[PDB]
Amino acid sequence: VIRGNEVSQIAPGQTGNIADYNYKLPDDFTGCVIAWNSNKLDSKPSGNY
Amino acid sequence: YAWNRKRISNCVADYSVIYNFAPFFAFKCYGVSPTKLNDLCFTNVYADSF
Amino acid sequence: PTYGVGHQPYRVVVLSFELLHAPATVCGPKKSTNLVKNKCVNFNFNGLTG
Amino acid sequence: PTYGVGHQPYRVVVLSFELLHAPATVCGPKKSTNLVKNKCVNFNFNGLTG
Ligand SMILES: *[C@@H]1O[C@H](CO)[C@@H](O)[C@H](O)[C@H]1NC(C)=O
């Protein structure tokens, strides 16, 4: 589960924060990426920590 | 019709902090890539707001 | 929940497939046909046509 | 209404256009001009320039 800013970073040949230190895809990647909003479950008024 | 231009010069530009300032999806760049804005470096920046 | 649309949580699942010379352990829903030889046919051997 | 963003209803209108193989009936808003002959001009006959 990421923030909606870094959905573009889950792609081959990318740099940033998630692609550099968290989750890096190979350059010869063959597969699919599926991302969907989860505001109903992963969001809390006090703040999901 | 009265869009504002802001003139940016003589500073160090960090483009990874722009993501923390507005909740946008796409950093839609044309001549460059948004992930390479820190390695290469420019001359002048102009910011138009409307 | 009060954040903008670019700060909402997003659930991500990445499905990566091995495309190798190994025998196909997991693959998809196709019905198999009886094998005939010495006859000009169209074959589909583990997903590749000819 | 409690479904997710992928399970919302969507209204779809598909405009199917068929091109200039017949005398034209659907036209955009443009003004015609008097026809002049035996001169080098920039014509526009039913959407094709030259
Ligand atoms: C913009 O400035 C105001 C006050 O100067 C501050 O409260 C607000 O958090 C700033 N916006 C962002 C996105 O930080």
> Which 3-state string (H, E, C) describes chain D?
CCCCHHHCCCCCCCCCCCCCCCCCCCCCCCCCCCCCCCCCCCCEECCEEC
Contact A25/A12 with Cβ under 8 angstroms?
Answer: yes
Query: Is the Cβ of D4 closer than 8 Å to some Cβ of chain A?
Result: yes
* C7 with B24: Cβ contact below 8 A: no
* Three-state secondary structure call for residue C48: strand
Residues B35, B15: Cα–Cα separation, whole Å: 9
Q: Residue D2: what residue type?
A: T
Query: Is the Cβ of C26 closer than 8 Å to some Cβ of chain A?
Result: no
Residues D31, D28: Cα–Cα separation, whole Å: 10
Long-range contacts of B45-48 (CB under 8 A, 24+ apart): B45/B7, B45/B8, B45/B9, B45/B13, B46/B5, B46/B6, B46/B7, B46/B8, B47/B5, B47/B6, B47/B8, B48/B3, B48/B4, B48/B5, B48/B6
Q: At which residue do the structure tokens 């300032």 appear?
A: B21
Contact residues, chain B, for A4 at CB < 8 Å: 23, 25
